[PDB]
Design a protein around this ligand. Structure first.
Ligand SMILES: *[C@@H]1O[C@H](CO)[C@@H](O)[C@H](O)[C@H]1NC(C)=O
Ligand SMILES: *[C@@H]1O[C@H](CO)[C@@H](O)[C@H](O)[C@H]1NC(C)=O
Ligand SMILES: *[C@@H]1O[C@H](CO)[C@@H](O)[C@H](O)[C@H]1NC(C)=O
Ligand SMILES: *[C@@H]1O[C@H](CO)[C@@H](O)[C@H](O)[C@H]1NC(C)=O
Ligand SMILES: *[C@@H]1O[C@H](CO)[C@@H](O)[C@H](O)[C@H]1NC(C)=O
Ligand SMILES: *[C@@H]1O[C@H](CO)[C@@H](O)[C@H](O)[C@H]1NC(C)=O
Ligand SMILES: *[C@@H]1O[C@H](CO)[C@@H](O)[C@H](O)[C@H]1NC(C)=O
Ligand SMILES: *[C@@H]1O[C@H](CO)[C@@H](O)[C@H](O)[C@H]1NC(C)=O
Ligand SMILES: *[C@@H]1O[C@H](CO)[C@@H](O)[C@H](O)[C@H]1NC(C)=O
Ligand SMILES: *[C@@H]1O[C@H](CO)[C@@H](O)[C@H](O)[C@H]1NC(C)=O
Lengths: 729, 729
């Protein structure tokens, strides 16, 4: 075979790009798409389009626009620039509104610089933005803004935006604003991190900064004081320049106010009904409140009889947090994915007045998410097809008869497509299907009335042609049994794989709670190069604690992090080493974050199964990690709760067992998520027991070590390491 | 040869130990010494002794006594415990005075815990100590102490003790209080670091600390705001008679007050005469003031007729600072080492009220230091013998006839002793000579009346015996000539060294201003093993900028750090290569501190001479290092001074060149001296240009990385690296 293999440079340089097709539904019949660089509008039914905005309309803007956002009515466009990243979702920027009618950019009453967040109303073109931790509203882009809040105070009071832990572990967003459907009310949360300790670390910046700066971020570690939260709703239709806006507060339920708790979900049901979910610090009990607007009193009332309790006796509630409800048109009922009697996550139908929900789906498989709802059907994605937890398809169930379930993606192209995600238009008149594996990504448009296939948006013909000139590796998805249970794994096999030969093996690991490293998704990554060029087999295993297979597996590691998930990887390796094509003398292991944790716990387990391992930004001791994520699985690190296990699941305690393995520890000094502190403590422990090891720190890089240069440098360094570790002497 | 070799474990485990003989003169006739664990007192004249304090006395003290101190009058002993290190010289501890006579421990008016510094008066048993940055005095060990200052303030005002930069760069000591000869007066310095920027960095501490601590230290980097200082003197004899004894200030001379300056030397001449030396921020001009106590005003006056100036046109003043003066008993004249008309430092005789001194020694060699002065003789140490800059010997000159100079150590044992050190009794009646090379250390006692050897105190017979059964390396000390100038170097050659073979060479480098890596001292270090076991030739070279050879060589680097000292090391390598017994392919380089900086600079020069190099705690950009030391050689980093060379002599600007070598970067994270920032900026520059290298950080280790575990870990790590870089298929 004279074809080139997939090299490290291809991965690092993106020599082979997967074409995408990111669209944005602006109605039930049209969607926006970024062609060349200008914006076009498409009619889903025919495929014809028109330019919605010339890629040259802002040639002399005098600023590079980071991103845009058209108002719902297509009347305005919010140009974002001066982008400056903060954590995973947060960031600041400067904004400018450009009237699409007058074809002139508004120069009056502009959004302030260093705006923390902005958002159009769902309908029309109102604006709500957060500045210096306060909320403002603009009924018209060129009119003054109303200041909705006055308590904003950096690192203390957040209004409309999340603090560090809420953004990363609860909302996966920086936004803490929620417009009501027609945009009348603006619901927002308020966080107070007054007593939350600050994580502190150095930032060196450019070489010209003489003194390094100390970054201080309110971050609650396991057991520390968490931020507190309040909810509010304000009417934007009745705001005045004279008096200040009045926000009506909706206090949490009594079962929540008896101790620490979190706001974990906000969802409008109708124009005057809002539902909220609260979660106790001990995350196995949550309650939903449904609040109706009292047009007379002007206040919001949430009738007890409308409260819905959700709790688990075997673990935490929900996959990472209680699922979102999907209300019906009238808002009188709703569907919500909850764990069932047998511990499998399915869709349950709820009446806001009745307390017993009804399951409309069942079986030893799970519903990943509810994607769309009509009076006749509910569309969702699950891993039911062929009973493969790693696969995903679009299904729809008839609401009048649950026995009638129809898969809409299963048979489209079975050999190429086994993992879809979907995108429906405003009224579910149309939907885009996105297939991401096992073969190359495929995007298609469909109509709901007859579930007919309209057309192909992107099939990646190009990439496919070039990939043909390459010796691409293959992927094997399968399972092994452990104690009657079925656990899945996948192997990235080198080209021209020969079962008579023996290859070294690299166990790519994550294994966090509800994780899944064994799926049918097609990926171009480091593993791709290792198998294509170094002829290294890259495997992954989903053991206990893994997700999408029911709580018996997922909850297996409840209050016991660092046990079964770590054991199962070892047992997984142990079994792969027993296979004919694996060289038991050359088996490595690596992970990032939780994978780093697991990778380290495995190397210090004393199993003798692994020769070397690489841990990138690993967690080393749970009391070092954040409260919301750690406590969810571990509980509180108090003597009367689970402190003992907190102290027994550290990497440090296993230092000596590293004497017989080659270890490479990497971490960014500016990691605000998994603090460098965790790696510094791992290293000190190894030094304490005299174990040599490899290390690499990245100045000013954070948890993702994603800067262009750092990204290439870390993968290059790790590659040298794995290569040296597998070098046949 | 079947004898074992000196191994790494040998060096790391202290298998072959150098015996020592540390005595403490308590008078002009006897000294204290620890045979086992008890303290013994020896009669120097006959060598007979007895137990001053037997190891049984403090068994039930309930504390580990770290160190002890006897009051001048021998009536009390100051016990030190609860010792907690801080910087290079500073620390806090607890103390308990023991009443040697009543053989009882005092429990009244005890010195407070967390005392920063404590010292007896030169005579009697008065005590002076610093607590919470203020000065206190105890006339009697059991009586209440008097408070001398009320301005103390953590990290802001220091009375009696130095700040970070004064301790490390100006006084090499933590204390800043000077008792007068008979103890009547107590003088002290006061430092104000109100506007001095702070260096900040994390300290992780034990695994049990949830949130790392941020260590903050007032530390002025190059060109930043320096601490200001003030001098005072209090009459301790008036304390019991006065309510609040007043501290009299002796202001600096106007020639210093015009700008930033430093108090760099305090020396009492008589009971009522004290001398002060001030140095301008631009360290090429110092002034000495000799101040006398005016009894009728209780004030201190410094007559201009006694003000002496000491500048330099080719560099800074002194080796590292203006030298200390040595006054004759009447205080009317003094001796002092200063650079002469040829640039060689020699002893000059001064008459306090005469601006022209007389040199009492001369030639092309230098006086290392004045050790003792009697009415008839002045004893000094120089490197005049055989013209060896790396040699050291005790000399005696006749005050009445300068042509009368006797060397007291030159011939005692010429083959085995070339590097001497001395310790005279309280009145120079006896002196211990301490030989440290080229043979095993030798300690001997002598009598001044006739310069006769009283006896040998330690000769290291045992060790010599042990070392006999080991293939120890040999050390060659010689010179090469460049531009008619002699430049010394030393080589640790492996056993059975053969000039017919080619040996890999490791260049041990420091090369800071006034440094000296080539000398006659005998050592058992990492190099010993590299030559003995790994058969590696470890060489060091003193090029331009090195010391003890005149200002022509030492001031060659004036305002140009990162140049000649760097090139000369490289030119050194070539020369050794020209010597025919070096593998031109296996030449490595390594250094600590300035050593690390020069190593990096060399490695990034592109000479293609060095294959690999190791830099530990290196300086990388002079603007990151402290004022006093940096500015002393580089001036100020301003456009109108020397900013251009500051920005042009950094390691970072040479990143692209490290693509030609194997680099190992190592740094302690709690390094208060050479901040981690320095290596953090290097690594970042390398990553920014796609250079692969090896790094290693030591959690919570300071600039010395001397903790027991970290010490073994780093050398073990560096050993693998060197052996890898020199591996030869
Ligand atoms: C698509 O074509 C129809 C007529 O065939 C037209 O009415 C519609 O506006 C077009 N859509 C776009 C956005 O070009
Ligand atoms: C939005 O709903 C509110 C409350 O039901 C109503 O008063 C308002 O007029 C509605 N706005 C529109 C245009 O639907
Ligand atoms: C934030 O919480 C603190 C208590 O920790 C409270 O005193 C303060 O008033 C709160 N801030 C506001 C104004 O909500
Ligand atoms: C507006 O209300 C805030 C508190 O909500 C108060 O601090 C401020 O003084 C008020 N001023 C105005 C705009 O009336
Ligand atoms: C939630 O977890 C706690 C701690 O393990 C447990 O005591 C409690 O019963 C759980 N909640 C329930 C009843 O499911
Ligand atoms: C040595 O002998 C002398 C004889 O006068 C005696 O006084 C002295 O104490 C002895 N040395 C010691 C300290 O034991
Ligand atoms: C110390 O010197 C002072 C000042 O000259 C003098 O008054 C005092 O008596 C001396 N102290 C002693 C030890 O006698
Ligand atoms: C220290 O200096 C500051 C100004 O730099 C001054 O305000 C303060 O009084 C000084 N402290 C002293 C000398 O006691
Ligand atoms: C002693 O004098 C100093 C300086 O005048 C003064 O600041 C301090 O308060 C005084 N202490 C007492 C005990 O009065
Ligand atoms: C002291 O150093 C500065 C900077 O080089 C220089 O301009 C000045 O003339 C020097 N003075 C002496 C004593 O040479």
């Amino acid at each position: 075979d004279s074809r080139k293999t997939y090299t490290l440079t291809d991965y690092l340089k993106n020599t082979y790009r997967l074409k995408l097709y990111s669209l944005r539904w602006i109605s039930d019949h049209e969607y926006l798409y970024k062609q060349e660089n200008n914006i076009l509008v498409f009619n889903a039914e025919y495929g014809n389009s028109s330019v919605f905005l010339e890629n040259s309309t802002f040639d002399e803007f005098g600023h590079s626009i980071n991103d845009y956002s058209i108002s719902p009515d297509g009347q305005f466009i919010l140009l974002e620039y001066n982008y400056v990243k903060q954590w995973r979702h947060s960031y600041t920027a400067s904004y400018d509104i450009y009237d699409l009618n007058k074809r002139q950019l508004i120069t009056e009453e502009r959004i302030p610089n260093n705006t923390q967040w902005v958002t159009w109303s769902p309908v029309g073109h109102k604006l709500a933005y957060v500045w210096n931790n306060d909320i403002y509203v603009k009924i018209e882009p060129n009119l003054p803004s109303y200041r909705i809040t006055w308590t904003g105070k950096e690192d203390i009071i957040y209004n409309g935006i999340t603090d560090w832990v809420y953004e990363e572990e609860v909302f996966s967003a920086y936004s803490a604003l929620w417009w009501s459907p027609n945009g009348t009310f603006l619901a927002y949360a308020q966080f107070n991190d007054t007593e939350v300790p600050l994580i502190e670390y150095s930032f060196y910046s450019d070489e010209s900064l003489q003194y390094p700066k100390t970054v201080r971020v309110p971050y609650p570690k396991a057991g520390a004081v968490n931020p507190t939260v309040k909810f509010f709703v304000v009417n934007t239709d009745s705001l005045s320049s004279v008096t200040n806006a009045t926000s009506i507060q909706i206090t949490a339920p009594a079962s929540m106010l008896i101790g620490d708790h979190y706001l974990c979900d906000v969802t409008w049901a109708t124009q005057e009904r809002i539902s909220l979910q609260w979660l106790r610090r001990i995350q196995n009990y949550s309650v939903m409140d449904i609040c109706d607007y009292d047009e007379s009193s002007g206040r919001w009332n949430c009738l007890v009889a409308r409260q819905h309790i959700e709790m688990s006796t075997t673990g935490w509630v929900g996959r990472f947090r209680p699922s979102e409800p999907h209300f019906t048109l009238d808002g009188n009922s709703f569907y919500k994915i909850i764990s069932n009697e047998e511990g499998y996550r399915h869709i349950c139908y709820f009446q806001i007045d009745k307390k017993d929900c009804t399951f409309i789906t069942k079986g030893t498989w799970e519903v990943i998410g509810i994607e769309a709802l009509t009076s006749d059907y509910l569309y969702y994605i699950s891993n039911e097809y062929k009973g493969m937890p790693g696969g995903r398809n679009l299904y729809k169930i008839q609401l009048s008869d649950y026995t009638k379930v129809t898969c809409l993606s299963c048979e489209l192209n079975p050999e190429r497509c086994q993992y879809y995600s979907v995108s429906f238009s405003k009224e579910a008149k149309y939907y885009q299907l996105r297939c991401s594996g096992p073969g190359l990504p495929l995007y298609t448009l469909h109509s709901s009335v007859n579930d007919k296939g309209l057309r192909v948006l992107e099939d990646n013909s190009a990439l496919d042609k070039m990939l043909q000139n390459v010796q691409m590796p293959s992927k094997k998805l399968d399972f092994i049994i452990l104690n009657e249970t079925k656990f899945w794994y996948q192997m990235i096999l080198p080209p021209h794989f020969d079962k008579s030969k023996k290859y070294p093996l690299l166990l790519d690991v994550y294994a966090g709670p509800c994780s899944q490293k064994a799926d049918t998704v097609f990926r171009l990554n480091w593993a791709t190069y290792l198998a294509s060029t170094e002829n290294i087999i890259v495997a992954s295993f989903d053991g206990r604690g893994s997700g999408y297979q029911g709580d018996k597996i997922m909850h297996a590691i409840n209050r016991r992090l660092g046990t079964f998930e770590v054991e199962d990887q070892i047992e997984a390796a142990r079994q792969f080493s027993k296979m004919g094509f694996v060289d038991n003398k050359r088996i490595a292991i690596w992970g990032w974050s939780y994978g780093g944790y697991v990778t380290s716990m495995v190397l210090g387990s004393g199993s003798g199964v692994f020769k070397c391992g690489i841990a990138v930004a690993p967690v080393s001791r749970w009391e070092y990690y954040d409260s919301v994520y750690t406590e969810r699985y571990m509980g509180l690190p108090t003597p009367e709760d689970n402190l003992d296990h907190y102290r027994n699941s550290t990497v440090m305690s296993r230092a000596e067992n590293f004497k017989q393995v080659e270890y490479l520890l990497i971490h960014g000094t500016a990691d605000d998520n998994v603090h460098f502190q965790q790696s510094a403590q791992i290293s000190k422990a190894l030094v304490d027991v005299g174990v040599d090891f490899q290390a690499m720190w990245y100045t000013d890089e954070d948890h993702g070590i994603a800067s262009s240069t750092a990204h290439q440098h870390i993968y290059t360094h790790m590659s040298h390491f794995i290569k040296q570790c597998f070098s046949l002497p």
